[PDB]
Structure formats: C-alpha cells, structure tokens
C-alpha cells in the first residue's frame, strides 16, 4: 500500500530535544534518514557477522555492543556504549 | 604623456577569489542538461530507448560532482607534491592509480 | 557622418580610439536621442560644459567598460573613415614610437 | 492502556519499527528484546551528536534552519565523522574552506 | 546523442577544479578529466541497468542509482537509504 | 616499547627491496615504524575485540583474517 516508513517524526523530537528552536528542510531530513538507515544496517550487519562467527543464533544486545565498538570510531564509540547500555538498563528496569 | 591601463585584477587574484566563492557554494558546477544528456548516450549500448526517474540524474550529477572535487584535492596535493601549482594529467593519473583503479 | 550606434573613432588623450554612439545630443533643443525616441538630460546625467554648446555624442570605447563611456563633440569625435583610419594607424605608430622611446631610455638607464 | 517501549527505555526513537526491521532484515535466527532498545539508544545518540554539530553550525553561519551546507561542516570539522563518514558523499554540501599554504600569495 | 561529453564545457570541469582548490590548470586536461567521466560513469551506468533491467523495470530509477554507488564505494546520501 | 625498534633498519629496507625501492632516506625508517604501529593498534583492536566477544581471552589467527576482513585486506592460509 501508499505508507511509507520513515524516522521524520522521531529525529524531529530527538532535535527538538537537543534544540527547541531550530527547523528543518525536507532534504536535509532525507540526509539524516538515510544517514541513521546507513549506520543501522552497517551495525546491526557487523552484527549478524558476530552472531555466525561465534557459532551463535540470536543478536543479544551484547553484539550490537561489539559490533557499535567495533565499527565507529573510538570516540563517538565509548560514549554510544554507554548511551546505549544505561538505555537497556532503563529498559529492564521499566521491564 | 600619461596613457591609460585598465583594471586588471593580477594572475591569481582573480583565480583565489573565485576559489574562496566556489568553495561556499554547494550549487552544482556542472550544468543539468548538458548533463543528463552526457548519461542518455552512454546508457545506449547497455540497452536502448531507457527512461529515467526525476532524480536519477540529479543524483549521478552531483554524485560525479563530488567525486570529481575529490579527486582534485588529492590532485592539487600531487601538483605540490612536485613543487608545482599546475596541475598534470600525470596528477589524476596518479590518484587514481594510488586509489586502486588505473 | 555620425549615426546611432555606428563605429567612430575618437580623441582620448594624444590617441584614437574606436567607440559606439549609444546617445546623440543636441544643444538647442536640450536633449539627445538614445537607442535600446528624444529624451532630456536625467538626474544624474551631465555634459560638461565645453562640448554641450556643441553637437555630443554618447560614445562607449571598445575593448573597455561602461566606466569609460563618456560625452565627445566634434572635437573629440570623428567619422569612421579610411582617412581617420590611417590617422590612427599614424597615431598609433606615434605611440609605438614612444613605447620604443621609453625602451631605449631604460635600457640607457640600465646601463 | 498500552504504553510504548520507547517510554519503557526513555528514548524517542521507536523500539516497535526497528525490531521489525532487524527482524526482518534477518540478521539473526532469534531477535532478543533488548537489541532493538539499544539500537535505537546507539542511532538517536548519532542522530543526535550530528544534529548537535549541525545547530552549532547553523549558529555560526547565523541561520534558524539547518541546511546541509549546515551537515556538511558538522561532519567534516568532526575528524572522528571524518573516517566514519568521509567514505560518505552527501547531498548538496560543498567542501570545507581550505587552501594550501603554498597556494597563498607571499 | 553522440560525443555529448563536451557538454561540460571546460568552463565547468575548471569550476569543480576550482571547487577542488587548485591554481592552474594545464591544456590537456580537459579530455582526460572528461575521461575520469565517461569511464567512471559508464561503470556506474553498468550497475544501475543491471539493477533497472533486474528488477523488471523500464526506467532507470534515482534509487537503482544510489543503490549502484552503495555497492562501488561511492555511495551518495540524501536520496533513501 | 622496545619492540617497536626491533622492527630493525635492514628490515625496513628488506620491506622496500621487496617493495622495487632503490634509495631510501635516513628519515623514512622512525615515521614507517609509525605508520606500522598505527596500522598495528587499529587491526589489533578489531580483532581483540572479537576475541572478548567470543568469551576468549586468546586471540586466533581466524579472529586475525576476521578483523582484516573488517578493515577490508584478507589474508590466506592463516585459518578462513
């Protein structure tokens, strides 16, 4: 069907999170969408490798970890990890 | 006695100023027709009579655009590397045999 | 003779110079004629005063920019004929002449 | 009353579309629960320090809206983006104003 | 269309040199820059037909472009993921 | 440390000899051990990486192929 799928909403909160003030083009939101649909399939790949090197079946948030370590580079790496586990440790603790 | 000279901007001047505009623009160089035609040619002998999407071209252009601009920065580091500011065809030669694809 | 937008050469200093007559003035009627029709002087227009009582021309220089455009009478203007033509030949051997003329003063000068 | 994962694990990018697209994607024989809450928690955070530089740029060319000209300079002043991006062409960015100092006048 | 290559007059191959940063440009470049073209698109062009023509389409699609840069290492943003 | 001298003068040459090099600078041997090293620490920590993945705490020659293949060069008969 018509419904196209696409993270416009979520990075204008995310934006608006980080500055309540600013706007945004249309193209320029293209860059950001194809840039966080990059970045996931380069993560969540790096991943799947992991997974079939390690003989395993399941992406635990434990690859997605080695993999975001092991793809950006080491100073926006150290900061995502720890963005990312307080994130699923909030997300255990909310259950 | 005292005869005119024009207003001449000296060699380089001109060629720095128009460097420092440029490299504020984003607007493509290369124009869009003589550019979408450059593709219909090539795209002949692969297969005939294609059509192409609103935004194919526009996306091949600024993409051989980018590439280009690319190139001559490593181009333009190879003319120095030499001594030189004129750049040579044995410049891009170069690049593009140290990028892996003379 | 003169005519609007015809080749014409003129003074400028000791030398001739070929120029396009974009506007023809006339003094009794205090207006000139321009081409893209009589129209006066506008507000920031202005001809100096030794020519205006003289037939102008609006004359652009070739080879150079609008910032030379200037007002010439027939002091400064003259047909474009084969004898102004040889006259600036003459006159640009003349300068040759003097550009000669300044070599060998600095090559003196040099020595 | 249904209350979303994303407000279970305080972010604003959405668990529900990106387990459905690392489901999908089949990147695995079994997804877990918790590695699309850390995707999302490690893709808002690159969302973000972008859109961040992004701002500071838009502040100093003293617009209210970001343009890419705006993204460009986020990424490219960044020299950690710079290899994690400068393998990345973007739309409509230009380069960064550089000249070499041979090329400069004396 | 035949030789449509000197469309980009050389004019333009010297404004994305200027984008490029470089002084002076020498006379024979223009034909071998338009070469770093015609062969760099002609590979690009390769990949989106292969693409178009495989996924049963008669057009030439801007997302079979992208997709074509995704695969070379010369990838392209701003136009979907 | 002191191994990063161990990567000797006659060596680094041996490296340019293979390499079709003829004249070397007295400059290239201490910036080339560098570019070794950098070279060195970046694999290393791809493949350390996928080390502690795996619960190991000894790193293979397949976590070495593996780590190149990250970085992009592959290498044969060293396991993959």
Same mark, same amino acid.
């Given at each position: 069907?018509?419904?196209?799928?696409?993270? /416009?909403?979520?990075?204008?909160?995310?934006? *608006? $999170?980080?500055?309540?003030?600013?706007?945004?083009?249309?193209?320029?939101?293209?860059?950001?969408?194809?840039?966080?649909?990059? !970045?996931?399939?380069?993560?969540?790949?790096?991943?799947?490798?992991?997974?079939?090197?390690?003989?395993?079946?399941?992406?635990?948030?434990?690859?997605?970890?080695?993999?975001?370590?092991?793809?950006?580079?080491?100073?926006?790496?150290?900061?995502?990890?720890?963005?990312?586990?307080?994130?699923?440790?909030?997300?255990?603790?909310?259950? | 006695?005292?005869?005119?000279?024009?207003?001449?901007? =000296?060699?380089?001047?001109?060629?720095?100023?128009?460097?420092?505009?440029?490299?504020?623009?984003?607007?493509?160089?290369?124009?869009?027709?003589?550019? $979408?035609?450059?593709?219909?040619?090539?795209?002949?002998?692969?297969?005939?009579?294609?059509?192409?999407?609103?935004?194919?071209?526009?996306?091949?252009?600024?993409?051989?655009?980018?590439?280009?601009?690319?190139?001559?920065?490593?181009?333009?580091?190879?003319?120095?590397?030499?001594?030189?500011?004129?750049?040579?065809?044995?410049?891009?030669?170069?690049?593009?045999?140290?990028?892996? %694809?003379? | 003779?003169?005519?609007?937008?015809?080749?014409?050469?003129?003074?400028?200093?000791?030398? +001739?110079?070929?120029?396009?007559?974009?506007?023809?003035?006339?003094?009794?009627?205090? +207006?000139?004629?321009?081409?893209?029709?009589? $129209?006066?002087?506008?507000?920031? %227009?202005?001809?100096?005063?030794?020519?205006?009582?003289?037939?102008?021309?609006?004359?652009?220089?070739?080879?150079?920019?609008?910032?030379?455009?200037?007002? !010439?009478?027939?002091?400064?203007?003259?047909?474009?004929?084969?004898?102004?033509?040889?006259?600036?030949?003459?006159?640009?051997?003349?300068?040759?002449?003097?550009?000669?003329?300044?070599?060998?003063?600095?090559?003196?000068? *040099?020595? | 009353?249904?209350?979303?994962?994303?407000?279970?694990?305080?972010? $604003?990018?959405?668990?529900?579309?990106?387990?459905?697209?690392?489901?999908?994607?089949?990147?695995? %024989?079994?997804?877990?629960?918790?590695?699309?809450?850390?995707?999302? /928690?490690?893709?808002?955070?690159?969302?973000?320090?972008?859109?961040?530089?992004?701002?500071?740029?838009?502040?100093?060319?003293?617009?209210? =809206?970001?343009?890419?000209?705006?993204?460009?300079?986020?990424?490219?002043?960044?020299?950690?983006?710079?290899?994690?991006?400068?393998?990345?062409?973007?739309?409509?960015?230009?380069?960064?104003?550089?000249?070499?100092?041979?090329?400069?006048?004396? | 269309?035949?030789?449509?290559?000197?469309?980009?007059?050389?004019?333009?191959?010297?404004?994305?040199?200027?984008?490029?940063?470089?002084?002076?440009?020498?006379?024979?470049?223009?034909?071998?820059?338009?070469?770093?073209?015609?062969?760099?698109?002609?590979?690009?062009?390769?990949?989106?037909?292969?693409?178009?023509?495989?996924?049963?389409?008669?057009?030439?699609?801007? +997302?079979? !472009? !992208?997709?074509?840069?995704?695969?070379?290492?010369?990838?392209?943003?701003?136009?979907?993921?």
């Amino acid at each position: 069907k018509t419904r196209k799928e696409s993270y /416009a909403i979520y990075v204008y909160k995310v934006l *608006k $999170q980080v500055h309540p003030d600013t706007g945004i083009s249309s193209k320029a939101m293209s860059i950001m969408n194809s840039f966080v649909n990059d !970045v996931f399939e380069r993560i969540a790949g790096e991943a799947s490798r992991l997974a079939h090197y390690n003989k395993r079946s399941t992406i635990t948030s434990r690859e997605i970890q080695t993999a975001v370590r092991l793809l950006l580079p080491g100073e926006l790496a150290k900061h995502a990890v720890s963005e990312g586990t307080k994130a699923v440790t909030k997300y255990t603790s909310a259950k | 006695g005292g005869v005119k000279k024009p207003h001449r901007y =000296r060699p380089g001047t001109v060629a720095l100023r128009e460097i420092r505009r440029y490299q504020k623009s984003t607007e493509l160089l290369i124009r869009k027709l003589p550019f $979408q035609r450059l593709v219909r040619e090539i795209a002949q002998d692969f297969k005939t009579d294609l059509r192409f999407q609103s935004s194919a071209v526009m996306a091949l252009q600024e993409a051989s655009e980018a590439y280009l601009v690319a190139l001559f920065e490593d181009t333009n580091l190879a003319a120095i590397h030499a001594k030189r500011v004129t750049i040579m065809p044995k410049d891009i030669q170069l690049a593009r045999r140290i990028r892996g %694809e003379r | 003779e003169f005519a609007l937008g015809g080749r014409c050469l003129a003074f400028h200093g000791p030398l +001739m110079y070929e120029a396009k007559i974009l506007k023809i003035w006339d003094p009794s009627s205090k +207006m000139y004629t321009s081409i893209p029709k009589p $129209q006066k002087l506008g507000e920031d %227009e202005s001809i100096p005063e030794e020519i205006i009582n003289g037939k102008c021309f609006f004359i652009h220089y070739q080879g150079w920019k609008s910032s030379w455009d200037e007002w !010439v009478g027939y002091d400064r203007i003259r047909a474009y004929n084969e004898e102004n033509i040889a006259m600036k030949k003459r006159l640009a051997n003349e300068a040759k002449e003097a550009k000669k003329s300044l070599l060998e003063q600095q090559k003196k000068k *040099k020595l | 009353k249904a209350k979303t994962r994303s407000s279970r694990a305080g972010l $604003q990018f959405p668990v529900g579309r990106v387990h459905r697209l690392l489901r999908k994607g089949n990147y695995a %024989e079994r997804v877990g629960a918790g590695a699309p809450v850390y995707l999302a /928690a490690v893709l808002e955070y690159l969302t973000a320090e972008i859109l961040e530089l992004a701002g500071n740029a838009a502040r100093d060319n003293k617009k209210t =809206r970001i343009i890419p000209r705006h993204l460009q300079l986020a990424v490219r002043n960044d020299e950690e983006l710079n290899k994690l991006l400068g393998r990345v062409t973007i739309a409509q960015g230009g380069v960064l104003p550089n000249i070499q100092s041979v090329l400069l006048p004396k | 269309l035949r030789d449509n290559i000197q469309g980009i007059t050389k004019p333009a191959i010297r404004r994305l040199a200027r984008r490029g940063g470089v002084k002076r440009i020498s006379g024979l470049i223009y034909e071998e820059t338009r070469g770093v073209l015609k062969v760099f698109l002609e590979n690009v062009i390769r990949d989106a037909v292969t693409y178009t023509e495989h996924a049963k389409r008669k057009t030439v699609t801007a +997302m079979d !472009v !992208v997709y074509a840069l995704k695969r070379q290492g010369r990838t392209l943003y701003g136009f979907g993921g």
